[PDB]
Design a protein around this motif. Structure first.
Motif, PDB file in Angstrom:
ATOM      1  N   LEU B  83      48.367  32.056  50.044  1.00 29.37           N
ATOM      2  CA  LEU B  83      48.383  32.463  48.775  1.00 29.37           C
ATOM      3  C   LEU B  83      48.000  34.033  49.056  1.00 29.37           C
ATOM      4  O   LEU B  83      48.689  34.971  48.654  1.00 29.37           O
ATOM      5  CB  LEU B  83      47.780  32.161  47.842  1.00 29.37           C
ATOM      6  CG  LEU B  83      47.594  32.902  46.327  1.00 29.37           C
ATOM      7  CD1 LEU B  83      49.150  32.888  46.089  1.00 29.37           C
ATOM      8  CD2 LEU B  83      47.252  32.186  45.165  1.00 29.37           C
ATOM      9  N   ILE B 144      43.241  39.486  31.845  1.00 32.39           N
ATOM     10  CA  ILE B 144      43.505  40.171  33.333  1.00 32.39           C
ATOM     11  C   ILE B 144      42.418  41.052  33.579  1.00 32.39           C
ATOM     12  O   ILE B 144      41.775  40.795  35.025  1.00 32.39           O
ATOM     13  CB  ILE B 144      44.663  41.006  33.203  1.00 32.39           C
ATOM     14  CG1 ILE B 144      45.816  40.042  32.839  1.00 32.39           C
ATOM     15  CG2 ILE B 144      45.007  41.621  34.478  1.00 32.39           C
ATOM     16  CD1 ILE B 144      47.233  40.800  32.441  1.00 32.39           C
ATOM     17  N   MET B 147      39.692  38.641  34.805  1.00 31.16           N
ATOM     18  CA  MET B 147      39.997  38.101  36.279  1.00 31.16           C
ATOM     19  C   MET B 147      39.896  38.902  37.454  1.00 31.16           C
ATOM     20  O   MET B 147      39.451  38.761  38.513  1.00 31.16           O
ATOM     21  CB  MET B 147      41.058  37.416  36.009  1.00 31.16           C
ATOM     22  CG  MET B 147      41.589  36.370  37.070  1.00 31.16           C
ATOM     23  SD  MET B 147      40.334  34.806  37.004  1.00 31.16           S
ATOM     24  CE  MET B 147      40.890  34.045  35.315  1.00 31.16           C
ATOM     25  N   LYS B 148      40.310  39.929  37.112  1.00 26.25           N
ATOM     26  CA  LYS B 148      40.179  41.007  38.223  1.00 26.25           C
ATOM     27  C   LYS B 148      38.938  41.646  38.581  1.00 26.25           C
ATOM     28  O   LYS B 148      38.703  42.050  39.939  1.00 26.25           O
ATOM     29  CB  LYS B 148      41.090  42.367  37.926  1.00 26.25           C
ATOM     30  CG  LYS B 148      42.721  41.998  37.416  1.00 26.25           C
ATOM     31  CD  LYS B 148      43.482  43.074  37.959  1.00 26.25           C
ATOM     32  CE  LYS B 148      43.008  44.563  37.942  1.00 26.25           C
ATOM     33  NZ  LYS B 148      44.276  45.309  38.499  1.00 26.25           N
ATOM     34  N   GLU B 161      47.004  47.862  45.715  1.00 32.23           N
ATOM     35  CA  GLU B 161      48.124  47.173  45.001  1.00 32.23           C
ATOM     36  C   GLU B 161      47.529  45.796  44.669  1.00 32.23           C
ATOM     37  O   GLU B 161      47.289  44.896  45.521  1.00 32.23           O
ATOM     38  CB  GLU B 161      49.463  47.460  45.646  1.00 32.23           C
ATOM     39  CG  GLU B 161      50.542  47.087  44.810  1.00 32.23           C
ATOM     40  CD  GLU B 161      52.070  46.890  45.451  1.00 32.23           C
ATOM     41  OE1 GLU B 161      52.929  46.974  44.748  1.00 32.23           O
ATOM     42  OE2 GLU B 161      52.011  47.098  46.829  1.00 32.23           O
ATOM     43  N   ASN B 162      47.627  45.266  43.253  1.00 26.38           N
ATOM     44  CA  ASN B 162      47.294  44.082  42.874  1.00 26.38           C
ATOM     45  C   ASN B 162      48.436  42.934  42.472  1.00 26.38           C
ATOM     46  O   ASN B 162      49.106  43.354  41.404  1.00 26.38           O
ATOM     47  CB  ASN B 162      46.123  44.170  41.757  1.00 26.38           C
ATOM     48  CG  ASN B 162      45.056  44.787  42.144  1.00 26.38           C
ATOM     49  OD1 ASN B 162      44.430  44.881  43.313  1.00 26.38           O
ATOM     50  ND2 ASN B 162      44.649  45.965  41.260  1.00 26.38           N
ATOM     51  N   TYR B 163      48.887  42.264  43.471  1.00 27.45           N
ATOM     52  CA  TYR B 163      49.808  41.333  43.238  1.00 27.45           C
ATOM     53  C   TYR B 163      49.203  40.115  42.230  1.00 27.45           C
ATOM     54  O   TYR B 163      48.146  40.143  42.038  1.00 27.45           O
ATOM     55  CB  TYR B 163      50.328  40.627  44.572  1.00 27.45           C
ATOM     56  CG  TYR B 163      50.929  41.802  45.207  1.00 27.45           C
ATOM     57  CD1 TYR B 163      52.180  41.568  45.462  1.00 27.45           C
ATOM     58  CD2 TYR B 163      50.356  42.383  46.136  1.00 27.45           C
ATOM     59  CE1 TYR B 163      53.148  42.526  46.186  1.00 27.45           C
ATOM     60  CE2 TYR B 163      50.815  43.602  46.976  1.00 27.45           C
ATOM     61  CZ  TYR B 163      52.362  43.424  47.129  1.00 27.45           C
ATOM     62  OH  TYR B 163      53.062  44.352  47.756  1.00 27.45           O
ATOM     63  N   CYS B 164      50.418  39.444  41.649  1.00 25.47           N
ATOM     64  CA  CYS B 164      49.961  38.479  40.551  1.00 25.47           C
ATOM     65  C   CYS B 164      49.319  37.250  41.334  1.00 25.47           C
ATOM     66  O   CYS B 164      48.247  36.525  40.592  1.00 25.47           O
ATOM     67  CB  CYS B 164      51.027  38.053  39.973  1.00 25.47           C
ATOM     68  SG  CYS B 164      51.902  39.311  38.998  1.00 25.47           S
ATOM     69  N   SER B 165      49.443  37.164  42.604  1.00 23.07           N
ATOM     70  CA  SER B 165      48.873  36.108  43.428  1.00 23.07           C
ATOM     71  C   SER B 165      47.243  36.413  43.331  1.00 23.07           C
ATOM     72  O   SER B 165      46.381  35.193  43.478  1.00 23.07           O
ATOM     73  CB  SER B 165      49.158  36.359  44.853  1.00 23.07           C
ATOM     74  OG  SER B 165      48.829  37.539  45.290  1.00 23.07           O
ATOM     75  N   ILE B 167      45.592  37.124  40.638  1.00 23.29           N
ATOM     76  CA  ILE B 167      45.262  36.530  39.413  1.00 23.29           C
ATOM     77  C   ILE B 167      45.198  35.017  39.339  1.00 23.29           C
ATOM     78  O   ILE B 167      44.405  34.259  38.823  1.00 23.29           O
ATOM     79  CB  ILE B 167      46.315  36.904  38.260  1.00 23.29           C
ATOM     80  CG1 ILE B 167      46.439  38.353  37.926  1.00 23.29           C
ATOM     81  CG2 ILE B 167      45.871  36.113  36.879  1.00 23.29           C
ATOM     82  CD1 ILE B 167      44.827  39.114  37.690  1.00 23.29           C
ATOM     83  N   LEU B 168      46.068  34.510  40.210  1.00 24.85           N
ATOM     84  CA  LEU B 168      46.375  32.886  39.947  1.00 24.85           C
ATOM     85  C   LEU B 168      45.170  32.299  41.033  1.00 24.85           C
ATOM     86  O   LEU B 168      44.692  31.646  40.729  1.00 24.85           O
ATOM     87  CB  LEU B 168      47.885  32.643  40.707  1.00 24.85           C
ATOM     88  CG  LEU B 168      49.110  32.992  40.638  1.00 24.85           C
ATOM     89  CD1 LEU B 168      50.108  32.007  40.601  1.00 24.85           C
ATOM     90  CD2 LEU B 168      48.976  33.958  39.170  1.00 24.85           C
ATOM     91  N   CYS B 171      41.996  31.491  39.260  1.00 24.55           N
ATOM     92  CA  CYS B 171      42.270  30.595  38.323  1.00 24.55           C
ATOM     93  C   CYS B 171      42.038  29.370  39.244  1.00 24.55           C
ATOM     94  O   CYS B 171      41.571  28.396  38.745  1.00 24.55           O
ATOM     95  CB  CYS B 171      43.547  30.660  37.569  1.00 24.55           C
ATOM     96  SG  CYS B 171      43.840  32.057  36.609  1.00 24.55           S
TER      97      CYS B 171
END
Ligand SMILES: Nc1ncnc2c1ncn2[C@@H]1O[C@H](COP(=O)(O)OC(=O)[C@@H](N)Cc2ccc(O)cc2)[C@@H](O)[C@H]1O
Ligand SMILES: Nc1ncnc2c1ncn2[C@@H]1O[C@H](COP(=O)(O)OC(=O)[C@@H](N)Cc2ccc(O)cc2)[C@@H](O)[C@H]1O
Lengths: 356, 353
Positions: B83, B144, B147-148, B161-165, B167-168, B171
């Protein structure tokens, strides 16, 4: 050979499928896809989050019939986990599943052809192949940045304005994954869902995947009152529901916005156009002799013409729109009256509080 | 009765002494009275060769915890490495690294009944509905921005650059804590934010069984200003597979300011790894430079270094010698077990991403 009749047929099919669409991405890929000498897999997905309104019942059915009578398979994706993720019914999964069961009962009585229709539950299907599904979701998440994903907020009825929970990042990733997981050829959802459908096409380019889904978006059925662009549960007083009684429909239609000799933003005209005309293949305007007597509109252009020029009174458009919507709803009513188990389901369903 | 409270107390003192920071000490006591077999875990992205913090330093803590009846899970975070774009996102390479990690760990003091090597991919896939349901429920509990705040747990920052990965991943790491029924999160301080997140999730959900965070301090990298040994900080690391001359080479080039303990990597190794392993520090050196001296306390070692009694060159020579001594079983295992050897050779080829 004279198999030029195949090209003629495909073009006939393409034009017919597109007549039901608001936007196709792209029409050429759709023709290509139709020449695939094989059934195309289409889908639409639904959050089981309250009563069904007529866009999701009557309008959907028109579109699905057109598709399945032209070599397509259609999947209704009962997006239960998605509803939970989006906090519907307080996220209570037992209520969501009951609503989901209710939706299927409705769709099964909508005069849809079922030979080529499938109802699939997100939770069931994902858990049949969790490794593949979740691997896909992860791979999608590593491909787009947060801001890009945040522009899919609309697909869940959310905005940047409200507090943005991480679930609002996972949800789009999961919806995008669905498209591949289900091997969809054609995403056939409302235009409000398009951003995540576009995101999936982008994913294909990034991953150099040649099999790209076609986005066949239908337009939003408008709400009953002026300025309501989208019939829905979250717009107070906008919706006619699949369980509305005859007098209910009459009452909501009578109260609806239907401006004299104007079609733009006229929800009543929109129901005539998007639901009744495609269902009957004619619009038969029944009206008193006082008002010019019955007239059958064999084409939408004639209908628009007589309305825009005041030949059709609004009252007459309303009365007829109400009548046809009642006739279209009758099979559903009949089912929920004669089938005691369905009746009970509807009964339990109405008891719920619609959480956002 | 009394001896019991004495037992639990000593234990609690053992556990606590390791830690850089424990949240919270009282809860730890309650945990011990409730269960002698606590579950502790640490987790590793198989993203390249293992540096000495994850082996030699790790062993000191693990053995102290297991000897008290605790079970210690090593979470081979294969899906997490993927990931997080490690090893070019090649699952096959990640797995190979994971296998090499286990060979290193078994040879440096953690071939034992009370240690478990668990693969994230495998374990998640035994109960995917439960795991993912948890990940989803955690996601709907935090916004968000909150979480960041956990970005450091994967070596990332707000800056990039912050990819959605990104965030996951947190979690999922937070889900792991509950999914493995962890009693004590025993990770580096750099992982603390997601561990605090889990404790916050318990309060939100009214979960009374709440994990204790026992974070260890970061081992500095070889070069000046590098506060954390890592694959990401360039030439900052000594690896568990480094040869004797590699070790000598790297220690010789390392940062070791005279008189200064703070931010001194070489002193840190003496303090955090060597001294606890040998319960002494034997400083070999020429008479003219002060002669051999055995240190029985860190206080005497620190005093002497601070006052310039130990020259950086003598500290380096001795630290290198000790590190080499400690790596010997690992060295032997990889020179002898041909299977492990082939794994290493292969593993060394891979490009770190
Ligand atoms: N007023 C109106 N006119 C025309 N079409 C309409 C409409 N309201 C809603 N629709 C369409 O119904 C489908 C389901 O609506 P939804 O429950 O709001 O769907 C969204 O929540 C989706 N994110 C659900 C979903 C999850 C996962 C997946 O793979 C696909 C869908 C929509 O097509 C909507 O446009
Ligand atoms: N320089 C230094 N000194 C002391 N401890 C150190 C260190 N560098 C790394 N550590 C600790 O080793 C463990 C593994 O490090 P990592 O692979 O970078 O771990 C992170 O990527 C984790 N997010 C992996 C992970 C995923 C999921 C899960 O449930 C648990 C862990 C860490 O403890 C680190 O502090």
């Amino acid at each position: 050979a004279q198999e030029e009749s195949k090209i003629e047929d495909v073009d006939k099919i393409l034009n017919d499928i597109l007549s039901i669409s608001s936007e196709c991405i792209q029409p050429d890929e759709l023709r290509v896809k139709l020449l695939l000498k094989r059934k195309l897999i289409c889908y639409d997905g639904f959050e089981p989050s309250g009563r069904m309104h007529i866009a999701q019942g009557l309008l959907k059915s028109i579109i699905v019939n057109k598709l399945t009578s032209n070599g397509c398979t259609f999947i209704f994706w009962i997006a239960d986990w998605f509803a939970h993720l989006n906090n519907k019914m307080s996220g209570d999964l037992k209520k969501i599943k009951k609503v989901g069961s209710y939706f299927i009962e409705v769709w099964k009585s909508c005069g849809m052809n079922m030979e080529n229709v499938q109802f699939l539950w997100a939770s069931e299907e994902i858990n049949k192949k969790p490794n593949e599904y979740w691997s896909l979701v992860l791979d999608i998440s590593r491909s787009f940045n947060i801001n890009r994903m945040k522009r899919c907020l609309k697909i869940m009825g959310r905005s940047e304005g409200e507090e943005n929970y991480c679930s609002q990042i996972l949800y789009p990733c999961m919806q995008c994954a669905d498209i591949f997981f289900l091997n969809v050829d054609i995403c056939q959802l409302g235009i409000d869902q398009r951003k995540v459908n576009m995101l999936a096409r982008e994913y294909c380019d990034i991953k150099k995947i040649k099999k790209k889904p076609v986005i066949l978006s239908h337009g939003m059925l408008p709400g009953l009152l002026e300025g309501q662009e989208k019939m829905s549960k979250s717009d107070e007083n906008s919706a006619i529901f699949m369980d509305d009684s005859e007098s209910d429909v009459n009452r909501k239609i009578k109260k609806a916005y239907c401006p004299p000799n104007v079609i733009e933003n006229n929800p009543i005209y929109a129901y005539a156009k998007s639901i009744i005309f495609p269902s009957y293949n004619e619009f038969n305007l029944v009206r008193k002799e006082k008002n010019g007597g019955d007239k059958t509109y064999y084409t939408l252009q004639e209908l628009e013409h007589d309305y825009v020029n005041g030949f059709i009174h609004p009252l007459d458009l309303k009365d007829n729109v109400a009548m046809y919507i009642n006739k279209l709803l009758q099979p559903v009513r009949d089912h929920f009256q004669n089938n005691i188990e369905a009746k009970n389901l509807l009964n339990e369903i109405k008891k719920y509080k619609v959480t956002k």
